[PDB]
Amino acid sequence: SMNPPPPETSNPNKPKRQTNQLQYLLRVVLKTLWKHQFAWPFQQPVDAVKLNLPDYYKIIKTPMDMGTIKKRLENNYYWNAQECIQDFNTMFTNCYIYNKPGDDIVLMAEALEKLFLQKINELPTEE
Numbered sequence: 001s002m003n004p005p006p007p008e009t010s011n012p013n014k015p016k017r018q019t020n021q022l023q024y025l026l027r028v029v030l031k032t033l034w035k036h037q038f039a040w041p042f043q044q045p046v047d048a049v050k051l052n053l054p055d056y057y058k059i060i061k062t063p064m065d066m067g068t069i070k071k072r073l074e075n076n077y078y079w080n081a082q083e084c085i086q087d088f089n090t091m092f093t094n095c096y097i098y099n100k101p102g103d104d105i106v107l108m109a110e111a112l113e114k115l116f117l118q119k120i121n122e123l124p125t126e127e
């Protein structure tokens, strides 16, 4: 089995905007998570071919990862901050679907999620 194509990251057919919340999501939330010790398995799509995981995309039908999120923010792909927050949540939930609770990668994801949740509690005001 092949990997699926990665998620879309740009779309000229959607209107674009910059907002305080979107800027915060890139400059604070994504930046902080990206630099974390345990970021790296989450910094690009799961390469199921390289990892020899033929069942990964048999269950995970909405893949998401921080590399995709980073590009989406850079490309003004999201109009509303909650679209981006949803993508982070999807990334965490995928990890907790495919992987057994307590396993190494799950512990890594939970540490990242903790930091994510702290940063989201400090989201700036809406326009």
Ligand SMILES: CC(=O)Nc1cccc(-c2ccc3c(c2)[C@H](NC(=O)OC(C)C)C[C@H](C)N3C(C)=O)c1
Pocket (backbone or CB within 6 Å): 040, 041, 042, 046, 047, 051, 053, 056, 094, 095, 098, 099, 104, 105
């Ligand atoms: C040495 C090595 O593991 N090099 C490597 C290279 C690139 C990506 C990944 C990589 C990418 C994604 C994931 C995993 C590994 C996890 N398997 C695993 O040993 O995780 C360790 C980091 C505890 C499996 C799981 C499918 N996963 C996620 C995020 O749900 C791994």
